[PDB]
Symmetry: C3
């Protein structure tokens, strides 16, 4: 049974400013992913995760913010040659009120079983412009594990 | 190998007020769950997840709050014809102090490998009365994936 | 197929003060883990999870803090006879500013697909001294599920 899976983590080879509408792109495959003998999702030079096999995947994302804004939030965007624009599959948010801009650490994690198609690209974007995150391997990452085969469950109208 | 798994996400077809002790009930199966050819957990009209196969499951829950209370928290309640009342399997909490009631977004995620019996019902309740959450598919959801067969690991005394 | 997996949860048989640099050690296997007929990770008397089989694991941790500090954070430490000191595999953080020390609940969850070797020990430590957490089964836990075989993906230089 092939292990169609990959883990990519932050690697600045760690504070990174992410501009409005830019995807997080300081990802790098973990060693077990680099060494994996299995067909698997891959990482593009733009920071997108490139899915090569259709199925239901467990997808998980963590962004570790070190930021002074009251609200930090990310979205997982899915693109594909067969759809116009982006689809938002997952969202995480953390928020607290402060009167002054104090930098503070907050990791925002989410995960779900998601249907993904061969040819999909996945990117993580912040929902609002200019947030700072720590791109260190234990702090920020995106990974996915194929759980089952599946036909496309949606059709056009 | 059957994929005994399901994902249900928020769908108001998105802000919902959840009354004290009421379960979150604006769930709907994701398309891959609707289309799944496999035996799987199902969703009742009360919002409970109905487990049909005994085993160890990965269970995950996210509630996306948009609320002005200082503390937001949910509990995962397990019921079954063979037990009196509810069992709390999982709990999530987020809290910060503010002097005035400012609405702010906070997603509360948790997951674990849990033993579930055929006939179990699972519901998510807030721990305190009247919190508002965003019931949109990318923001709030509950899913489970059977990982292994298992006999009942507890017995009565 | 063996289910090489275990779940350990907080059990004070629930507020616990964890001293600086001490590992969380009020863990206990969940009933399905106690009853599992499979080879699996085990729990040491020091609170470390003892890995017995090399592979890629889904590892997840939740610490439920009930604490008055502005920042709460934990790290997952990996040790092994073949490495000097500790490796940090995973980190979670939550932070908000308050002018006075008000106790408040915050669960800090993270998970990832991690390469683990037979003989590894895993411990959860707080990053800063003296935080209080609730060691109740639904609130705080550490679990892992082996997903695939894997050779050691790193070599010395």
């Amino acid at each position: 049974r092939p292990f169609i899976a990959a883990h990519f983590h932050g690697n600045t080879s760690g504070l990174v400013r992410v501009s409005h509408d830019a995807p997080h792109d300081v990802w790098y495959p973990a060693p077990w992913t680099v060494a994996s003998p299995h067909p698997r999702p891959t990482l593009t030079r733009t920071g997108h995760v490139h899915v090569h096999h259709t199925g239901v995947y467990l997808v998980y994302v963590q962004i570790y913010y070190l930021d002074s804004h009251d609200t930090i939030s990310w979205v997982l965007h899915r693109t594909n040659a067969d759809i116009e624009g982006r689809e938002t599959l997952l969202q995480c948010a953390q928020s607290s009120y402060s009167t002054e801009p104090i930098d503070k650490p907050n990791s925002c994690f989410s995960a779900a079983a998601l249907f993904l198609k061969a040819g999909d690209r996945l990117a993580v974007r912040n929902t609002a412009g200019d947030r700072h995150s720590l791109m260190q391997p234990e702090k920020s990452f995106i990974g996915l594990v194929k759980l089952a085969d599946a036909e496309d469950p949606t059709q056009e109208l």
